[PDB]
Amino acid sequence: LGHEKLTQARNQLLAEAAKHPDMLTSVRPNGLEDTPQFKIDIDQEKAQA
Amino acid sequence: GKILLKVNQDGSRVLLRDVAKIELGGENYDIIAEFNGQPASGLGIKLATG
């Protein structure tokens, strides 16, 4: 499935989870949220030349 | 496929797809299996010593 799709799934379940406060409190993700990152992509051709 | 091997005199590019079929395929083509004459795969298991 891949990260994105899982991240959705997770949220689905996590959203659907947090609407039953009757039975289930603090249903949280234990890991980290996606973040921005600076990608320095190289042109191959260019370097050759 | 879009890999760049060299750039040509007329300026065109030599892509990997130019000098190779590029396909998804088995690391090896040693084993071919068949369940009842039909296309199959499997894994045989060998119980660990003890």
From Swiss-Prot, chain B:
Q: What is known about its induction?
A: Positively regulated by MarA, Rob and SoxS transcriptional regulators (at protein level).
Where located? Answer: Cell inner membrane
Knockout phenotype, as recorded, reads: Loss of susceptibility to contact-dependent growth inhibition (CDI); inhibiting cells still contact the target.
Lineage, top-rank taxon, reads Bacteria
* Purpose of the protein: AcrA-AcrB-AcrZ-TolC is a drug efflux protein complex with broad substrate specificity that uses the proton motive force to export substrates.
Q: Which family does it belong to?
A: Belongs to the resistance-nodulation-cell division (RND) (TC 2.A.6) family.
Q: How does it assemble?
A: Homotrimer, with large domains that extend into the periplasm, interacts with AcrA and TolC. AcrA may be required to stably link this protein and TolC. Interacts with AcrZ. Part of the AcrA-AcrB-AcrZ-TolC efflux pump.
What protein name applies here?
Answer: Multidrug efflux pump subunit AcrB
